[PDB]
Amino acid sequence: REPTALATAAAIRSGATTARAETEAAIARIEALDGAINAVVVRDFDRALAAADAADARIQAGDTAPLLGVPMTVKEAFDVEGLPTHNIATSDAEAVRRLKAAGAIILGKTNVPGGSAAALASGMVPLELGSDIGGSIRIPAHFCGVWGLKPSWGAISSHGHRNGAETPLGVIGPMARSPDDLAAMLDLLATLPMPRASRPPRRVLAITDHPAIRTSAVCRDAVDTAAEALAGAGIEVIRSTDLLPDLARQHHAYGQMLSVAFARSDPTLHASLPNLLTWLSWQDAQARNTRAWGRLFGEVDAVIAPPAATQAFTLDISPYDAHLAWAGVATYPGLPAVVVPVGTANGLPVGVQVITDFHRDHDAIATAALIHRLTE
Amino acid sequence: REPTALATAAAIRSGATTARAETEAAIARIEALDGAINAVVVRDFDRALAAADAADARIQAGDTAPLLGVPMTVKEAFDVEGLPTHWGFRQHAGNIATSDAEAVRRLKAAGAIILGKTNVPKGLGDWTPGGSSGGSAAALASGMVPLELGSDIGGSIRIPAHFCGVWGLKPSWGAISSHGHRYPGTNGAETPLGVIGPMARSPDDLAAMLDLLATLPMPRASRPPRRVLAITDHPAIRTSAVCRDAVDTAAEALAGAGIEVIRSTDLLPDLARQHHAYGQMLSVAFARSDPTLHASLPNLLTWLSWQDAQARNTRAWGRLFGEVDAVIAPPAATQAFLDIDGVASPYDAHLAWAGVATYPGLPAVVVPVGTANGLPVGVQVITDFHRDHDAIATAALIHRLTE
* Three-class secondary structure assignment of B183-249: CCCCCCCCCCCCEEEEEECCHHHHHHHHHHHECCCCCCCCCCCCEEEECCCECCECCCHHHHHHHHH
CA distance B154 to B177: 18
Claim to verify: residue A131 and residue A210 sit in the same structural domain? no
3-class state of residue B72 by DSSP:
strand
Residues A158 and A212 grouped into a single domain: no
Contact between chains at B300 and A163 (C-beta distance less than 8 A): no
What sections of chain A are H helices per DSSP? 5-14, 19-34, 45-60, 94-101, 115-121, 138-144, 179-189, 217-232, 247-264, 276-296, 325-331, 361-374
Q: Which of A192, A260, A280 sits opposite B187 (nearest CB)?
A: A280
Q: How many CB atoms lie within 10 A of CB A193?
A: 11
Domain range for residue A140?
5-189
Q: How many domains does chain A have?
A: 2
Residues B148 and B242 in one domain: no
Whether B188 and A273 lie within 8 Å, measured CB to CB:
no
The reply to whether residue A164 touches residue B311, judged by beta carbons under 8 angstroms, is: yes
Separation between Cα atoms, residue B344 and residue B356, nearest integer Å = 19
User: Phi-psi bin for A334: left (phi > 0), alpha (psi -120 to 50), beta?
Assistant: left
User: Looking at the structure, do residues A75 and A211 belong to the same domain, yes or no?
Assistant: no
The conformation of residue A274, written as its DSSP 8-state character, comes to P
- Structure solved using which method? X-ray
B284–A276: do the CB atoms touch at under 8 Å? Answer: yes
Residue of B174, B188, B297 lying closest to A284 (CB–CB): B188
DSSP string covering B235-289: TTBPPPHHHHHHHHHHHHHHHHTT-EEES--TTS--HHHHHHHHHHHHHHHTTTS
Phi, psi of B33 (to 5 degrees): -100, 10
Query: From CA A119, how far away is CA A129, in angstroms rounded?
Result: 11
- On the CB side of B322, how many CA atoms lie within 13 Å of its CA? 7
Q: Report chain B residues touching chain A, CB-CB < 8 A.
A: 174, 179, 187-189, 191, 215-219, 284, 297-301, 303-305, 307-312, 315, 386
Shared domain check, B231 and B356? yes
How far is Cα A124 from Cα A39, in angstroms, rounded to an integer?
A: 10
* A354 contacts A163 by C-beta, under 8 angstroms: no
* Residue A121 C-beta-side C-alpha neighbours within 13 Å: 23
Are B148 and B238 in the same domain?
A: no
The residue among A249, A269, A267, A248 whose CA lies nearest residue A319 is A269
Distance CA A141, CA A131 (A): 12
A136 part of the active site: yes
* End position of a domain, from candidates B156, B191, B209: B156
Paired with B381 in beta bridges are B328, B365
Residues of A with CB under 8 A from a CB of B: 154, 159, 163-166, 191-195, 260, 264, 270, 273-280, 283-284, 287, 291, 359
**Cα distance between residue B378 and residue B366, in whole Å:** 6
Q: What are the Cα distances from residue A203, in Å, to A357, A360, B117, B313?
A: 13, 15, 38, 45
List of chain B residues whose C-beta atoms are within 8 Å of the C-beta of residue A268? none
Look at residue B31 and tell me if it is in a domain. Answer: yes
Q: Cα separation of B240 and B116, whole Å?
A: 35
Q: Which of A339, A24, A338, A361 is nearest to A198 (CA)?
A: A361
The dihedral sign for the CA sequence B358, B362, B363, B365: negative
Domain for residue A197, yes or no?
Answer: no
**How close A280 comes to chain B (CA, Å)?**
6
Q: Is residue B288 part of a domain?
A: yes
Count Cα atoms within 13 angstroms, Cβ side, for B133: 18
Closest in A193, A280, A291 to B189, CB measured: A280
Residue A140: inside a domain: yes
**In terms of domains, do A228 and A291 share one?**
yes
**For residue B111, what are the CA distances in angstroms to A110, A214, B65?**
52, 51, 6
CB contact under 8 A, A192 and B284: no
- Search chain A and give the residue with CA nearest B312: A164
Quote the CA–CA distance of B178 and B39 in Å, as a whole number.
22
For residue B260, the domain's CATH number is 3.90.1300.10
Element (H, E) at B71: strand B71-75
Are A192 and B386 inside 8 Å of each other by CB?
A: yes
Q: Which of B218, B297, B315 sits opposite A276 (nearest CB)?
A: B297
Tell me the H-state helices in A45-193: 45-60, 94-101, 115-121, 138-144, 179-189
CA A195 from centroid of its chain's CA atoms: 18
> Using the 8-state DSSP alphabet, how is residue B4 labeled?
P
Which chain A residues are closer than 8 Å to B305 by Cβ? Answer: 163
Give me the half-sphere count of Cα atoms (radius 13 Å) on the Cβ side of residue A358: 18
> Which of the residues of B are catalytic?
75, 132, 156
> Which residues, at least 6 apart from B235, have a Cβ–Cβ distance to it below 8 Å?
B271, B272, B275, B352
Question: Distance (Å, rounded) from C-alpha B200 to C-alpha B141?
Answer: 9
What is the distance in angstroms between the CA of the first residue and the CA of the last residue of chain B? 16
- Same domain, yes or no: B147 and B288: no
Whether residue A182 sits in one domain with residue A223: no
Whether B174 sits inside 8 A of A154 (CB atoms) is yes
| Whether B327 contacts B234, CB under 8 Å | no
Half-sphere exposure of B166 (CA within 13 A, CB side): 35
Residues A166 and A284 grouped into a single domain: no
Please report whether residue A150 resides in a domain: yes
d(C-alpha B386, C-alpha A232), whole Å: 45
Task: Please give the backbone phi and psi of residue B150, each rounded to the nearest 5 degrees, phi first.
Answer: -125, -175
- Amino acid symbol at A325: A
Note whether A178 and A216 are same-domain residues. Answer: no
Determine whether the interchain pair A273/B301 forms a contact, defined as Cβ–Cβ distance below 8 Å.
yes
3-state secondary structure of B69: coil
Measure the CA–CA gap between B182 and B185, rounded to whole angstroms. Answer: 9
Sign of the C-alpha dihedral computed for residues B91, B93, B98 and B103 taken in this order: positive
Query: Amino acid letter at A38?
Result: N
In a domain, A196, yes or no: no
Do residue B237 and residue B147 come from a single domain?
no
Best residue in A159, A162, A276 for a mutation probing chain B (most B CBs within 10 Å)? A276
Q: Which of B218, B300, B312 sits opposite A279 (nearest CB)?
A: B300
**Nearest CA-CA partner of B134 in B310, B359, B375, B329:** B375
Query: Distance between CA B200 and CA B177 in Å, rounded?
Result: 19
Start-to-end CA distance of chain A, whole Å, equals: 16
- A82 in a structural domain: yes
Round to whole Å and give the CA distance between A126 and A175.
9
Starting at the earlier edge strand, list the strands of the sheet with A40-43: A40-43, A105-110, A71-75
Boundary residue ending a domain (A136, A158, A189): A189
Which of A142, A167, A189 represents a domain boundary (last residue)? A189
Q: If we measure between CA atoms, which residue out of A130, A156, A157 comes closest to residue A142?
A: A130
**Is A126 among the domain residues?**
yes
